[PDB]
RNA sequence: AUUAAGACAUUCGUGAGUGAUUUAUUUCCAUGAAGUGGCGU
């Protein structure tokens, strides 16, 4: 039937997770390249993909090539015909081959014990504050670019009023203690260094393009892992290897674990992320794609969120693999992690609604909240 | 096939130029070539 896996990505170097102003881009290519924290989606898919294919040995070797009809139906059969694109974003079907799901990609921190792994996730950003959202009648109230909706009177649940020099809710990482929740600053996971390069033979460059560039890499520190959860169709398999996730030839290690069968992955990422959950508003687990935010602003009040760019990297089993790839056109604004939806009184179900359309953004572990 | 691939922080560059171990300082101070006669009553 399907079969579902627990894939763990651990570093061997310092990775480089970029893009959106990166390195060759034109227009003041701006040789200084800042690391993502994290690899997009897309990147794992196609990840995926390449070792599916490098498993059955089907891979584009050598200069421009072709491919025969067989194997171009095998290869439909096991990833299929085009690259993750954000114009099926609303489509029902992941589109692709036995890939059927994969969770978004989590932290988890490996403690030197056969004890279970520590899955870490951003802090929401209406952590250590309540906001109360007083609403009978006319008593205060705010136009966000021209929409009524109510003041949002916010508290540090220790009165006070929100101190935004105080704000530092944005810097944090939260995990499950015993019933207190653990914070871990950000620098306290991710390391960065600056590295210098240049090209030794001196030849015709302007700047931003002959040489001097800066790059951002990132180190994971020392516990600390990258791990998703995929489900196959059942008929292809994943060997544990060593792979190539991120810019700059950035190199990890897959351990392979399959998890008992019957397991929708969906539900236990939402097992894992349990504990941040709160009656009046919705976590953003995962970027998410609201096709209008106008539309979603109407329905919440105080959008206590933060955005992230998406761009994609499109290509189809039949592309220059040599070349300067084809990046997506339009350039997708995506919810930041963390994020919080404020609701109205009820109507939480038609957000979720909007918020769930997406199911092919679902299955590719982008729209998932708690 | 993944906002990817490719790229030595490198090429040129003498720790060198100018600059007396020189200036000041009596081998000097004290000091008798001196002392005494002897016998032959």
Redesign the pocket.
């Given at each position: 039937m399907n079969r579902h896996y627990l894939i763990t990505l651990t570093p061997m170097d310092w990775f480089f997770?970029?893009?959106?102003r990166?390195?060759?881009d034109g227009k003041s290519a701006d040789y200084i390249s800042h690391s993502?924290k994290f690899?997009?989606q897309?990147?794992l898919?196609?990840?995926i993909?390449?070792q599916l294919?490098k498993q059955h040995n089907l891979?584009?070797?050598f200069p421009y090539t072709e491919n025969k009809p067989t194997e171009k139906e095998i290869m439909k059969t096991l990833?299929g015909e085009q690259?993750?694109r954000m114009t099926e974003r609303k489509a029902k079907s992941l589109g692709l081959g036995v890939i059927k799901q994969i969770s978004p990609l989590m932290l988890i921190e490996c403690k030197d014990d056969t004890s279970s792994r520590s899955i870490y996730f951003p802090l929401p950003l209406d952590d250590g504050y309540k906001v109360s959202f007083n609403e009978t009648s006319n008593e205060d109230k705010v136009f966000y670019n021209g929409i009524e909706c109510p003041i949002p009177n916010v508290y540090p649940a220790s009165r006070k009023f929100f101190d935004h020099k105080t704000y530092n809710n944005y810097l944090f990482w939260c995990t499950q203690g015993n019933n207190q929740i653990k914070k871990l600053l950000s620098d306290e996971i991710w390391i960065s260094k600056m590295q210098?390069?240049?090209?030794?033979?001196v030849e015709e460059g302007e700047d931003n393009d002959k040489?001097?560039?800066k790059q951002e890499f990132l180190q994971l520190k020392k516990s600390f892992i990258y791990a998703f959860y995929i489900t196959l169709s059942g008929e292809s398999e994943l060997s544990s290897d060593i792979?190539?996730?991120?810019?700059?030839?950035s190199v990890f290690r897959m351990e392979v674990e399959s998890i008992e069968e019957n397991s929708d992955i969906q539900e236990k990422y939402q097992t894992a992320a349990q504990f941040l959950t709160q009656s009046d508003r919705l976590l953003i687990l995962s970027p998410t794609y609201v096709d209008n935010l106008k539309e979603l602003s109407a329905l919440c009040n105080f959008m206590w969120s933060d955005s992230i760019?998406?761009?994609?990297?499109?290509?189809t089993?039949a592309?220059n693999?040599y070349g300067?790839?084809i990046?997506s056109s339009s350039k997708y604004h995506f919810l930041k992690p963390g994020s919080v939806l404020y609701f109205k009184q009820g109507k939480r179900k038609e957000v979720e609604k909007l918020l769930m359309d997406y199911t092919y953004l679902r299955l590719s572990g982008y729209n998932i909240y708690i």
């Open positions: 997770f970029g893009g959106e990166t390195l060759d993502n690899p997009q897309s990147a898919l196609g990840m993909r390449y294919l891979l584009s070797q990833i690259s993750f210098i390069g240049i090209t030794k033979h040489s001097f560039y792979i190539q996730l991120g810019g700059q030839r760019v998406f761009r994609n990297i499109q290509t089993n592309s693999f300067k790839p990046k």
